[PDB]
Amino acid sequence: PSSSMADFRKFFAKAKHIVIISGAGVSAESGVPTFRGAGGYWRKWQAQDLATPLAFAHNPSRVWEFYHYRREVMGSKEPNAGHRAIAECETRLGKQGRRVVVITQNIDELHRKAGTKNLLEIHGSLFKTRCTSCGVVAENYKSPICPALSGKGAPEPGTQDASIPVEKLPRCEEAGCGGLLRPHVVWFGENLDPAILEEVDRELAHCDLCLVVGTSSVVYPAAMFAPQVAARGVPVAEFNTETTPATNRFRFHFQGPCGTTLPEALA
Numbered sequence: 001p002s003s004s005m006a007d008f009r010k011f012f013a014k015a016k017h018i019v020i021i022s023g024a025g026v027s028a029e030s031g032v033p034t035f036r037g038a039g040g041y042w043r044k045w046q047a048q049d050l051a052t053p054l055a056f057a058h059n060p061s062r063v064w065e066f067y068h069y070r071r072e073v074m075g076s077k078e079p080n081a082g083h084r085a086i087a088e089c090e091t092r093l094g095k096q097g098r099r100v101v102v103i104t105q106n107i108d109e110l111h112r113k114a115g116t117k118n119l120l121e122i123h124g125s126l127f128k129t130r131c132t133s134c135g136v137v138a139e140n141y142k143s144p145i146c147p148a149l150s151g152k153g154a155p156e157p158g159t160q161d162a163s164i165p166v167e168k169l170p171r172c173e174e175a176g177c178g179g180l181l182r183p184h185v186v187w188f189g190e191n192l193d194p195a196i197l198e199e200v201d202r203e204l205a206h207c208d209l210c211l212v213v214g215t216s217s218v219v220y221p222a223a224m225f226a227p228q229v230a231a232r233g234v235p236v237a238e239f240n241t242e243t244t245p246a247t248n249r250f251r252f253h254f255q256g257p258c259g260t261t262l263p264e265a266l267a
């Protein structure tokens, strides 16, 4: 795979429709905890233990504690130079009639905070709720999301369950509903929104340049998206930290934190 920034920049100058697939490394560069890899725990659990329908069914208080913590932590977090380069790229290109879309697996909204408008959040958002009775999706930035969760969700091992009664967990405020809310995020074992995937397929079909940032391209989610772009002859450029491996039938690979390489690539 080429690591020629100048060659990349020649494609970038001429590209009219860029798809940017954003993975977990973009969030990790802002210090956002993911509770996934080695060492990444909340109390005695990882995300694969708590971000499941079964976990929520059996202990909705514990799952709400986990997502309440993740909401509140964001008050100490900021977009990084990678987020900023991506947003500035969209803004500048949009005034030229050129399209930039960000397809992200990240749920912490830092792309939005940085100014990205054309955003597909394929795993949902920490700052949206979904009613488990009526299905309504709502924005929710309230600190705390409900009074019973104030001071709850502490991450330290040994912290006891809050065991909030389900009636005091976040509830739907649509007139005549009152159901129990869940976080509007995709759980392990769940389907991605087909309408989201409808929009993703349209962007992949039409783009003339594809970036994979903060993730590997040979793994989910980018492995679902990049192959068919590359198969069309569209250049695929990967920006990530792991020394290729990932092995790439793709055009470019730039090693390093994306906050180091993207400001230059997307200038």
Ligand SMILES: *Nc1ccc2c(C)cc(=O)oc2c1
Pocket (backbone or CB within 6 Å): 187, 188, 189, 190, 219, 220, 221
């Ligand atoms: N079921 C499942 C859920 C989530 C995954 C992520 C976030 C990454 C992955 O590589 O494979 C997953 C599989």
Ligand SMILES: [Zn+2]
Pocket (backbone or CB within 6 Å): 131, 132, 133, 134, 135, 136, 172, 173, 174, 177, 178, 179
């Ligand atoms: Zn409802």
